[PDB]
Nucleic acid binder design. Sequence first.
DNA 1: CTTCGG
Length: 561
Amino acid sequence: GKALVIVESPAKAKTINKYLGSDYVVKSSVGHIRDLPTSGDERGALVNRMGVDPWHNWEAHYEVLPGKEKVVSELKQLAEKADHIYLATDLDREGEAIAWHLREVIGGDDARYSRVVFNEITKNAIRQAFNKPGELNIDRVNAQQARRFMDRVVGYMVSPLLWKKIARGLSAGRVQSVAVRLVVEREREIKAFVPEEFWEVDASTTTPSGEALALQVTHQNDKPFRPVNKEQTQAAVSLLEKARYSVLEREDKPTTSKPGAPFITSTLQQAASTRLGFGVKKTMMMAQRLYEAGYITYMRTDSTNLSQDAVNMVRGYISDNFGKKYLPESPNQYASEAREAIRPSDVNVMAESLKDMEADAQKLYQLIWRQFVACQMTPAKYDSTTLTVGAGDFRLKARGRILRFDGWTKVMPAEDRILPAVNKGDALTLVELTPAQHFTKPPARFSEASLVKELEKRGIGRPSTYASIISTIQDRGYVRVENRRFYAEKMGEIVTDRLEENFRELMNYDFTAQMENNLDQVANHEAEWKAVLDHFFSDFTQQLDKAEKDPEEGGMRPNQM
DNA sequence: CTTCGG
Ligand SMILES: Cc1cn([C@H]2C[C@H](O)[C@@H](COP(=O)(O)O)O2)c(=O)[nH]c1=O
């Protein structure tokens, strides 16, 4: 009697079947099978639409997804002819919930099911995973459901208020709204910024040997040099033109540069954006394909941990392919659960050898591979130099450095300012002085890169949710991406102001981050899901009830006049 | 009309 192994996608089914013997039949569910209604007397109508009942202790009406009836039948029919069912969904909470939905729709004794967990699809990982199969974790499922229901309530109860008060078709979302707020705030900072004039002066000189030495003026009378207009710069240039220049100090020190940690979801998104020009969506879609194909570890992670076997494999690669000088004494540890960073499943698999992956996916694999190999290599070593020069009442500086050992940079694609030899007390001959006018700059616009970064920093959102927050926002008319930077739209500003005014708690960054903590508490049996939802709902209805009132009574302002 | 996840 064979066993039934169920996964989310045909691609994952294919890969996992490579490592499962004849006693297993693998089948995919082709994505989610059940969720809240697709949605296509007033309270009753609302509950019907939501698919959840906040007033009746969160009773839910899960419905099989449009067009999934046939796979459910295929699955039930296959479930019959099996002696055990292994739920092999992805390792995160959403994956736990999908496994749960499968178990619920298929039915049977819970003892007929096992939940297997792995962070990559390789022979050895599948072996370990099936050698020690666990049970469905209901706390993690409930944490998912809690998130799901909260999101649903906000969306379906706040949005209709927006239709009445501002405009039809608008949306609000527990997360989407807070993300928009960040962009709107940045927009207003930029619009309010008043740039200030400041000047710099550089000096080109020659050493006693005749070599060029470029210096920057740093101090005048022992105070930082920063003239604010042309008059002041010219007065300074006048003095600098006549001064005698000499080297006050030469400071030589060895410096190093360290490789970064291996990627996690947020840093991968950032590096793929800045280095490859890939949008967050593209990146996550390709990462998922690489993972389901068995080439990298799971792509939703916030851990920088590396298994002992993974570290062994990469140190072996470094020793064989770069040499002893590139291998640290002991492995580099980057951590702080059984989770791991985003890394190649097999270090001897090169991006060029990837089967059935487009060029851009190979480029992402390369990005991941290089980061993983580099993170276990030695630091690059430099000989840095700082020269301090005196000229009458002025102080000037020049900094340089020469690479002495490439270390981890050897694995990066194949250039430092070098300073001439001079000794303390040497006279320098002035050749030219170049003043330059500059102005202060407003805060930088959010890039798709910096935004993810900001959400992480504030504890808002998670690896499973940093994804495609940046699509509707744009569809929706709230913010738009232009020339690789975000711009708030007026409707974004209009909605944000209204939400901040009447849904202060919901829009508050710290409260939003706290909710992620609350959900983790549920996942870890430190809180109960319906109680957590009860508290959320009590606070939410307080805001909503008030928001619905006339503005004269403190309700949300209409979008008009 | 709408949520987050796809
Ligand atoms: C979809 C989903 C996944 N995850 C991911 C991150 C972790 O790898 C894992 C959660 O582990 P945990 O349930 O023990 O906290 O699932 C969340 O934390 N929250 C979610 O809502």
